[PDB]
Every structure is written in C-alpha cells, then in structure tokens.
Amino acid sequence: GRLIYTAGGYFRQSLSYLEAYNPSDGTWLRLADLQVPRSGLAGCVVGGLLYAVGGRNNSPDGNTDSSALDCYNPMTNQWSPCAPMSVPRNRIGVGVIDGHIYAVGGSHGCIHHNSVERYEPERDEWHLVAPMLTRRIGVGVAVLNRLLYAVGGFDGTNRLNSAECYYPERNEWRMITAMNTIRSGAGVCVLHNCIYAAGGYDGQDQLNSVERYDVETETWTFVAPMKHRRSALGITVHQGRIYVLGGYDGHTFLDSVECYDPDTDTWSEVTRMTSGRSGVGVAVT
C-alpha cells in the first residue's frame, strides 16, 4: 500500500537521502537522492506526487537557504524541479488545500517570515497570500475542514505557544486558542479531524508531550506522550496512525520512528531510520 517517504534532514551536514518505509512489512527502501541536499524542509503530497519544499543546504562549504520546490514521482523514481518560491524558507511549514500547496513562514538568514504563498501544480506558479499575524519559523502546519492552521514556532525572539488559522475564501488569518505548551519545531498534523502537536522545544528543553486541538470545543488537550522527546521531527499520518520521525533532543540526533495509535492512545517505537537525523521532510503516498 502507501509508503512513508522521508527526504533530506541533517547529521553533520544537510542530507540528500530519500527513503521509504513500509509499515505493513517493516521494510525500508532507498530511493533517488535529492538533487541538492536539504534540511529544515517540508514534505507534502498532491495527486500522488511528493513535493520537497524550502529548507537549506548547510554544509562545511557554507549555508544556502532554499526557495526550491522539487517534485518526486514514485512511479518514475525521479525528481523534477518546479518553480521556486518568492523567498527562501528554512524551517518552513506546509499544508495542502484544494490541491494547492501553502508554504508558511520559515527563515531566510536572520529574516523570520510572516509571509505565506500558494503553489498551483497545474500552472507551476506561486502566488503570495495574506501574511500570518506572527512571524514563525519551525512552524507546524495542518489543514482541517479546508482551513489552514499555523501552530507554534519561533518569531525571531521568542518561542511560541500561539496558533492562528487562515480562511482562504476571505484571505484572512485569525488567532485561535493558544497551546498549553510553548512549542517550536513541533510535528503538527491532522488526524481524525483534530490537529495534533507533538514534541518541539519550549525554550529550555525538548518535549515529549503531545496535545490535540478540537475546533468544536476550541480546546487543546494532552494525549499520551511520546517515549522520546524531540524537536525538528517529521510527522505524518498513515492508515489512521501518526508517525514521528527523527529529530534532535539536545544530546543526540534521533533515528527513532514512533507510531501513535489513537484507538488505544499509545505510542510505540516501530522502526528506526537508517541513521539519526533532524529536520526531515516527510509525506505519505
């Protein structure tokens, strides 16, 4: 069936790996390398194609933030460049609505973006939309009921517990209920119509706690914590379960992949990546 793809990441330098995990049989497959190494990117899927968005190439030869959008077709095992964003976005967050990719926040050098732009695959074109109310890098992004949510992050000075949401039909952002915890570099995704925020950095320590937002009650509630605290993790959903991949915990680069089963409210470590890394892009198709 569908596979969990992880692209890029960092360990000693930004990485070029593309690897796919099959949860059904527990196997990993190494696929075509990214054309340029990337960490701090985000992954998403539209129409069966995997996109790698933003990030940076941090190596001993220097750092270059990325405005790149690249597309991987599992059917060809090839990467194809697409149109670049208006600005480089390291530690970007992305979400998909109506088959368009929204690129949210991130940084370019010391600039922490509030800007947001939208990609239309059929036209290979990016368009700026209304900026967020807050500058946010290491921002978690998810889509619920065709609204875009931007959760936590770092504004250039402070790590954030705030969250906001974007209504495309009005092209407007509004603040929602703040999280219980400050989280920069959390994994944020939607599962069964709730927005989950897992891990992150609270300004002092990495987190293993996980909370979920219900738009109906406007409340964030804690669920079972992950076994391993982590920030700059990748998060995705496969067959109704959340998977978190890698990250950093202040001491090590995680290879751990943990799986959250909402039906039992438990996490387990289901596999490990081929090597420890943070700042991966991850998506499922």
Partner: peptide, 16 residues
C-alpha cells in the same frame, strides 16, 4: 568577517 566559531541551534542541532 572574523571567521567566528560555529554556533549550535538548540532546536535542530545544526551548527552555523
């Protein structure tokens, strides 16, 4: 301009 030592990112673990 001064070839400064790299600094650790507390959130990502990257050195820059």
């Amino acid at each position: 301009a001064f070839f400064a030592q790299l600094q650790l990112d507390e959130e990502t673990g990257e050195f820059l």
